[PDB]
Amino acid sequence: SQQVDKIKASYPLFLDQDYKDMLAKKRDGFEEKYPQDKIDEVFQWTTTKEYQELNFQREALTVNPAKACQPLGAVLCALGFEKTMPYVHGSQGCVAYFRSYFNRHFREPVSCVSDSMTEDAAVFGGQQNMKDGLQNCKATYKPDMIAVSTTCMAEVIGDDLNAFINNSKKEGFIPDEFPVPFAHTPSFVGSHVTGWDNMFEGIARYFTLKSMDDKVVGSNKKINIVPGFETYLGNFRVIKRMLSEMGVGYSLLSDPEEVLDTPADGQFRMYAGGTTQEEMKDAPNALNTVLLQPWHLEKTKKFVEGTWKHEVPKLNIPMGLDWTDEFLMKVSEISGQPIPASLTKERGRLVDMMTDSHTWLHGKRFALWGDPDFVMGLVKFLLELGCEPVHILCHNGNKRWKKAVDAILAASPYGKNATVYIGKDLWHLRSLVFTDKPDFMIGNSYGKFIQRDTLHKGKEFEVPLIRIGFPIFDRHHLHRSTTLGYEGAMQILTTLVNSILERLDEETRGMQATDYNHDLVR
Amino acid sequence: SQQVDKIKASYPLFLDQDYKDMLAKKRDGFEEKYPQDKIDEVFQWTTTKEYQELNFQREALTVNPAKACQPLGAVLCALGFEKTMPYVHGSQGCVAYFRSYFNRHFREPVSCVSDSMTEDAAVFGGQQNMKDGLQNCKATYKPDMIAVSTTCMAEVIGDDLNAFINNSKKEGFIPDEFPVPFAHTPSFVGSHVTGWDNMFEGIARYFTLKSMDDKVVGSNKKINIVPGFETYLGNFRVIKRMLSEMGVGYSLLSDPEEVLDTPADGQFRMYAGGTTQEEMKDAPNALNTVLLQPWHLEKTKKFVEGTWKHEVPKLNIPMGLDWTDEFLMKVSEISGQPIPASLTKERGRLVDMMTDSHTWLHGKRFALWGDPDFVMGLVKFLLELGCEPVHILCHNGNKRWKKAVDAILAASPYGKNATVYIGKDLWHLRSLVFTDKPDFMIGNSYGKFIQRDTLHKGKEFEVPLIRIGFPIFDRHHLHRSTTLGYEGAMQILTTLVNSILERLDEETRGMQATDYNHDLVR
Amino acid sequence: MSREEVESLIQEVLEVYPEKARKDRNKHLAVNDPAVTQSKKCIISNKKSQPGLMTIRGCAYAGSKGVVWGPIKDMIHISHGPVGCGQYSRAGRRNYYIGTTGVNAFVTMNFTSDFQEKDIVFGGDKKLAKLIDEVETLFPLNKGISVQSECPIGLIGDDIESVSKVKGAELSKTIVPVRCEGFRGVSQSLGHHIANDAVRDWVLGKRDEDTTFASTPYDVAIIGDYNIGGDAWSSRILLEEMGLRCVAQWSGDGSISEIELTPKVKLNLVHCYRSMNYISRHMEEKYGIPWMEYNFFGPTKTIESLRAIAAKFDESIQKKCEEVIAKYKPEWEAVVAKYRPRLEGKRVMLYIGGLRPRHVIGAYEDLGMEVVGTGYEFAHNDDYDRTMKEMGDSTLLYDDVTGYEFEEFVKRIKPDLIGSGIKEKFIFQKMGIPFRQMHSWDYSGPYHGFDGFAIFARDMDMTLNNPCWKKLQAPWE
Amino acid sequence: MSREEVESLIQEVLEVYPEKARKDRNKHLAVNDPAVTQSKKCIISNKKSQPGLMTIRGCAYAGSKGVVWGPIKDMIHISHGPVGCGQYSRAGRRNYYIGTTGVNAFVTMNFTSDFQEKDIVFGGDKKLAKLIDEVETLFPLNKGISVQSECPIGLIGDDIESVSKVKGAELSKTIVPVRCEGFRGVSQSLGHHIANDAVRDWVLGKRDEDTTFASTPYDVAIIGDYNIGGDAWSSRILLEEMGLRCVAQWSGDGSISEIELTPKVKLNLVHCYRSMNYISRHMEEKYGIPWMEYNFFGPTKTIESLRAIAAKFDESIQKKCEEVIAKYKPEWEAVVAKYRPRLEGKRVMLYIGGLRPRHVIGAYEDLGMEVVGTGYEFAHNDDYDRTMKEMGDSTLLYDDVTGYEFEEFVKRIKPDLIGSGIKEKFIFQKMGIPFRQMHSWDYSGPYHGFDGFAIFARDMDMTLNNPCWKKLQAPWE
């Protein structure tokens, strides 16, 4: 039943007595459900060290991964180029998913095409799909560039992208000079971040490999910036802001911040902003190229070093205080521009915030996950805050990366109770937050289910989620935030300390029981 | 007892059994405490309509006010002037409180002096305190200006500030040319915002009354901006940002954003930034003067209109969409500057956010409080969001202001269940959130105790606090936020929708009970 | 708009396309004539999508894993192949259930074999067998496993059927191989069919020789309700208030046992024709169980459906039917009284999957709204046959609409509201057109039944009439 | 620094002042000589503050309402006068209690008569009488009312004593007029005295003729512990483990009954000498109850105090004293073993109110730290007498230190840590000096007793050794 003045959605409608009774009858009659005591017994066992040991012995099964597949990253990379259509050669089901995954995170349109290979393409391959696809895409959506990646069907069948695109041009389906950079992006190698690297290097090659002989390093007086796979608008923005205030000439290579934040003004804009073709063509003339997320830009780095002859600096992601410092000092060195008064003051304001908030942050224990560069920058900043990053999970991390992070941990007393995990998933992380309970998780929306599980054991065991990473689907507009630079560090600090204080307020809200410590001032 | 590797502070130390038993013994032995059943009975009565009726009949008692006293506002006003020392003539107890109150909100030093009048000054007045106070302050803290306000002792005994300052100059305690603007700031009239108006008007008169004959309206081609009592750094910053982007010449009169946000770089800066004396002296040459918070700048308005001959526009605080639009359109009219593409796009991004979040905002019911302009701007934005601002409390509001807000409510169907209350306090508000329960409160930290009270009635009656206003003492760095302009609206929207989604996640986190609606995607 | 104007609109929109695509798309676009009974005279459907045109369609894995199997709550569904497909589809679809997730129910989890290069090169069958043992160790209360094949499985020649037989026998467990690789078919649709056949072949017959279940004359199953936001529960409640016993829900909040008990029912009640007609036909053929289509969108359709269902039983059920209708009359009448004046005359364009583009029309009409365009991602002509009589004359129909087409149709038609999916929502909002998600219910619902109509009405009103829509134009522009 | 460097530091700092201020401030600054027992030979105290110099002091209302009366949990304290004073002091001080706030306990609430112009012009006694009735109606479980006078009350000639007597008699209620207007005295100090005399005159005698209290030889009261962060509870526990019975706590977590029962005790244990010596002397004079000063900061002082207190009783208590000391030995030794190596040699400067600037020195010394400067807001020479023997030779003492002085002293001395208040905190952090709030305990604590010392140690370590302090200098400067 409903009362028209106070209509109930699923929650709390199905708590009405008639619905409760119905659901009980369904269970008892037809579901042949395990008895509640058995369910409770098994739940309890899943929280144990014994269960954790079995869990960590998995070799074949993955549960609740914390990574996605290559072409998702290629699509994001491609979106950052002016009037560029991402185009994934292969199976159209993939593209529905890539678009929806980003739609939910950005709450924006996400444009991407398929060339809709079907089973029949197993015989001859997808050449005809490419010819008609490129022609159809160009006529219909009027991109100035089509950036091609692949789905796993196309990879297994062995379609030669280069030959297929060349034959499309030869037979007149797409003009000879129309830009169609490409990259093979197998889902069964690496992760979404690898797809970004592959796509980027493909685009870079397309615009520069054949034209190197007129290029002079330094001649355009700019620094190239390669952001990698990045899903916070504030991160593209803060980098451009900092470089502008230092008077540094730069080219941000893959810059989707406009197309991922168009105004609602009565028209849909399929394309907005983005790195220009002129910027990609002129990129080898830069002083150098800085990689913001070097741990998933290794292929790009080899190309920039080997072909552009840029001496790519050994810089960490500019997250936290030390690494933002290092980034600015290196940019100053390369460009000849001093770090201006504005950035020096901003730095000092971050440090002020750290001094103000240190007592509540000190010793707080965190479980965290995400992509390798994000995770290591978060670890570093947590150590700078006097926090303990005790469960560090990077499903798509590698051995060399783990060694690097283990070295960061060793440089700080706050790293001494920390362990770095690679190849492990959120079902592994779930065990860790039961057996070696931290104060909080820092993670994406899939973390909510771990928090749910911890609360079921008891309120005293609940580990609250702090949402930082990707995807964030159950809060609105967090994709506008920043994690890089001093601005990002200020935002992360603020989020952490206030998450701490919210939880403390919860635990001290009990009238006459715990509210002796429900302080007005903290 | 303590375990050295897991030391307990008050919470949870005093939950240990030996402390609990000790506290039970103290109660039973010596406290002659009302029985728990009687405490429960009275508590329950305080949640009733019958109790509310008695509560609303109060004429003499105030409980948990949502206002402070005049000189607090004079001190904040004064802090916004370059190298200016706030100086409160009267009793030193007051200054300890004013400094601490702002220290706790900004987490920053707050410099202010007293001239330490004592009981002896009742015979003779505080003239000698002023003479030595002014001399001592100038020598010791080396301000370029001393801005003088009063405590209630000085007002009751009737000290003539003007004559005392004149005599201080006559007898050589400070130089004749040294600026000593003043205002009488009685704590028993109006509130802290009145103190701000009085101080500002005193400073404006000091620099302009006697030099009007060379002034020509519009000759400096700028617009003066008077912010009023403002405790979000982001609000001073956004106004300057928008005007600069628009290419509009302006003078922000009282601008404490630098002195309330100095860097932690190894030195203490007693003064930083601020409106210059030259800006105050030249202000009558502006095209016009815009008041950001007109409902507490009435005395200022009369001076600007009567003496500067500026035709102060009838503008609401620039909060929410319509009133930001109106502010920008008026500034465009006055300055001749078109609204730039950057601001048009920003507006459309706010509108996009409204479209994306409207389904969770729709029909949500709020209780809220604060100062009059802040409260009315918040009401307006809430209506624009399709929210219902059902309990609108402004302790320091007046009848004319209430009429204005009642009219705003009448312009929207979302105002039909709303009532505006003036002269009422947070103990009155506490009743309203029990008897006509909203979804959330939007308020300052004093709200936490109302949330505590509501939870005690039961989880289903708990009204969560969303912290927007002043003072905020139990979270860190919220004073960096923004509430004005499109940026402020985007911030408020975000906070509101995510507060809604956080509560929904809490309510749906129950394993097998309510987590059927614990959606990954919202 | 007249018939001639809509025909004009179609030709103008088709002008952008190269000739092959133009000729093809022309066949998938039509102006309704409710006189027509054979939609094969006016529209083509269930064909391949044209390359490069931004179809909104998914794949067979979405149709099998995402739609049919995934909701079954006490089984573990393996996304078998590389990591993408299971991650993008994890908890995307709001197929609600009651359970203890990770313990006895597994729906919002993502189990995957996470194929790497070595699995592609050498085959994943050994990994699958190992994975099954690991599932059994770590999730001992699972009541069955399905293997949801992703693109590489058939391409590389793996034999998941052998693995499922051998492991199912070794462990005395139902392990269901599903060849729903996304290269198969042209859309989600073939995934449904594949999934239905896998239920038939590996689950449905388990109790064929078991005589222990006590049946009654009033036993029914709800076939093809995936309980989006609780839709199946707000349907079931009515069927049971009418005196029926709902033995099974396929597959929203569904258990493996209630699927196994379904051959014991007296009548199969089909909501989603498109996804579960296959198994409904099978059950008629094999067990003699009749099936009938029904519609629980809005009070008009729900009342008609309750009566038509009750007519299959006896007088006692017909009497309870009228009691149910009498009970809810004032409730939905109050909904109409409040919301119809707010929505009367407003025009909506829909684009959804295989059922809702026709099924929700009545509910819109119950609020005085007019559905001026509709279409489907992956419907077949038997769906279009059912659609033409539900739509008004001269309205626009579109099969496998391209992004370009949908935008252009909306620019001309200027509907007051659009009802479609997540990939569409943000485009149309930026155009200043109120948008409701008609897959996910925009995180609201249920919409089925009387209780769902109240929520549906609230939702269309809150969005169509929202103050935000008056604010897209800056007042200086 | 040598005596002579500190001496020239004082002289240099005073050069900024006009002559009158310079001559005054010279008298309030001294270099310690622990040989002195008469501090009136080396420092002046408890005088007026010099105008315009940014004293850190508060007023008599802070010392009465904020300090002494405000913690009493089952009374309602009226901030009588305009709105400011009650609002700034609302829940600023962490005087912890157990109660049901708004129902039987009222500590963190702000009750005020909110004086307006008409109250100043015509007087507030009628408003006060009405306010009392309103309090009784809305807060029926209050066990007494105090009236905390703000500046205007005495200035306009109101007679709150008459109102309190008349209403007290009418309502059979304890209503206490407190003349703590901030114009009185020079600081918080006179507020304490005023408050003590108000307890004496209006509360303490209530049970003088009542012999029903079940007294024992082991009854004590904790006098002058305001339970900051639970400090009194972490003291009480030890006294009771030693076999004593703590009849009253003045006034942290204090009830009116426990105050009225205090004249029945055998011994008054005085922690805060400054604030409650007055009532302690009164109780000796009137009731013959002895009093003794103690110190519960750090293990060394706490052990000495337990022993000195136990020595006032019999062998049974002396034996329990040693049992308590043995019990806690491993706990505080573990604290020392963990933290002293992290803090050994570090130098601290303190500035606090009336007690802590000397009382905490032992606790610092238990962690190997040195207090190189200390001072008080509002102490009297009897406090300085007790300080000079606790501080090292040639250390700096400052009475009613000015903001300028405190900054300049810190610049030269370069302490490793500063312990002061909220008005000081952010100044010194910006200078790169670790700062701990030694009034509010920086929202931590308790610090009293054995359990408090653990938290104290943790806190001094987390702040002094925090990584942030290495980061104030940009690497390009």
Ligand code: CLF
């Ligand atoms: S039609 Fe899968 S998302 Fe793709 S590239 Fe392979 S991992 Fe990644 Fe359907 S079954 Fe899946 S979703 Fe596509 S791949 Fe095929």
Ligand code: CLF
């Ligand atoms: S010494 Fe009060 S804060 Fe003042 S101007 Fe009056 S309302 Fe405002 Fe002490 S008693 Fe109080 S705090 Fe001062 S006024 Fe006097």
Ligand SMILES: [Fe+2]
């Ligand atoms: Fe959006």
Ligand SMILES: [Fe+2]
């Ligand atoms: Fe600060």
